[PDB]
């Protein structure tokens, strides 16, 4: 196409943002950044779509150009910064913090969390590798490289980075029966223990996942994101605890809650 595309037609846009069909021709289109543009969430979406603090688009740069918002600690002013999974986003001028942790449909929950926790976040290691000058380094999913890590951490292990200082502080291995988040695929939004990793030499290992309500299911190796010991999360989980309820069951929970 002769080079980099810069627009985004308002339908090719990631569905989980829940933009509306009309309103205009276009969607925000993520900037280049820490997360893959289809797996991301523009700040502009968050502030005006998810948070409803803004109306215009102008009134978002309004907020952003005020440093009212910081992502993973740092002040980010880009209208369309590719904020994504495990991220924090902190609105100081209204003392609230969030965490971009998935819904159970597959969307980005407005899962508000404390000022504790906000000082850390998880990070699946994508590659761990020996850099130049004999130095080693891990590469988390969010586009962080942390040099000098524990020789114990291999790929698909998660890592508790700080947030103000880099630095890995504790880490979880990937093995039989750990608390797992699903980051994409059909089962996006789910949460549970493992049981089996089906190895397929050549490509695409598969992870059978059990939830607290005993519902086995499968995904691909990269879809899986370890987050703690069984029943013991390493972070706050949104409402519904990533369980996936059938639309039958779903019907009740709503109409039965209604009335009183």
111 binds Mg ion (CB under 5 A): no
Task: Candidates 29, 50, 111, 160: give the one binding Mg ion (CB under 5 A).
Answer: 29
* Nearer residue to Mg ion within complex by CB, 152 or 258: 152
217 binds RNA (CB under 7 A): yes
Report the C-alpha gap between 197 and 209 in whole angstroms.
Answer: 9
Report the C-alpha gap between 31 and 132 in whole angstroms.
Answer: 29
31 binds RNA (CB under 7 A): yes
Residue 248, binding choice from Mg ion, another protein, RNA, none, Cβ under 5 to 8 Å by partner class: another protein
* Nearer residue to Mg ion within complex by CB, 144 or 178: 144
Contacts (CB under 7 A) with RNA, residues 86-115: 105, 107
Give the binding range for Mg ion (CB under 5 A) out of 12-20, 78-86, 129-137, 194-202: 78-86
* Nearer residue to Mg ion within complex by CB, 29 or 61: 29
Task: Candidates 66, 114, 129, 236: give the one binding RNA (CB under 7 A).
Answer: 129
Strands (E), 5-83: 41-42, 69-71, 74-75, 82-83
DSSP 257: T
126 binds RNA (CB under 7 A): yes
Residue 229, binding choice from RNA, another protein, Mg ion, none, Cβ under 5 to 8 Å by partner class: none
Residue 80, binding choice from RNA, Mg ion, another protein, none, Cβ under 5 to 8 Å by partner class: Mg ion
> What's the Cα-to-Cα distance from 4 to each of 32, 86, 104, rounded to whole Å?
11, 28, 33
Q: How far is the CB of 187 from RNA (least distance, A)?
A: 6
Strands (E), the chain: 41-42, 69-71, 74-75, 82-83, 90-91, 96-98, 112-113, 125-130, 136-140, 145-147, 158-161, 168-172, 178-182, 191-198, 206-210, 217-220, 224-229, 232-233
User: For residue 8, how many other CB atoms are within 10 A of its CB?
Assistant: 17
């Amino acid at each position: 196409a002769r080079g980099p595309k810069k627009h985004l037609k308002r339908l090719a846009a990631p569905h989980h943002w829940l933009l509306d069909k009309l309103s205009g021709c276009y969607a925000p289109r993520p900037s280049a950044g820490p997360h893959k543009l289809r797996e991301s969430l523009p700040l502009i979406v968050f502030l005006r779509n998810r948070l409803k603090y803004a109306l215009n688009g102008r009134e978002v740069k309004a907020i952003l150009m005020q440093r009212h918002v910081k992502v993973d600690g740092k002040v980010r002013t880009d209208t369309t910064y590719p904020a994504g999974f495990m991220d924090v986003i902190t609105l100081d001028a209204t003392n609230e913090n969030f965490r971009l942790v998935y819904d159970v449909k597959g969307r980005f929950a407005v899962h508000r969390i404390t000022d504790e926790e906000a000082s850390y976040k998880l990070g699946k290691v994508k590659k761990v590798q020996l850099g130049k000058k004999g130095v080693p380094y891990v590469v988390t999913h969010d586009g962080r490289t942390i040099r000098y890590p524990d020789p114990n951490i291999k790929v698909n292990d998660t890592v508790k980075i700080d947030l103000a200082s880099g630095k890995i502080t504790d880490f979880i291995k990937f093995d039989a029966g750990k608390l797992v988040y699903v980051t994409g695929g059909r089962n996006l939004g789910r949460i549970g223990t493992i049981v089996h990793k089906e190895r397929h030499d050549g490509g695409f290992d598969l992870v059978h996942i059990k939830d607290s309500l005993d519902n086995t299911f499968v995904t691909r190796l990269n879809n899986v994101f370890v987050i703690g010991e069984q029943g013991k999360p390493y972070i706050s989980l949104p409402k519904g605890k990533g369980i996936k309820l059938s639309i039958a069951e779903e019907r009740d929970r709503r109409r039965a809650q209604q009335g009183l």
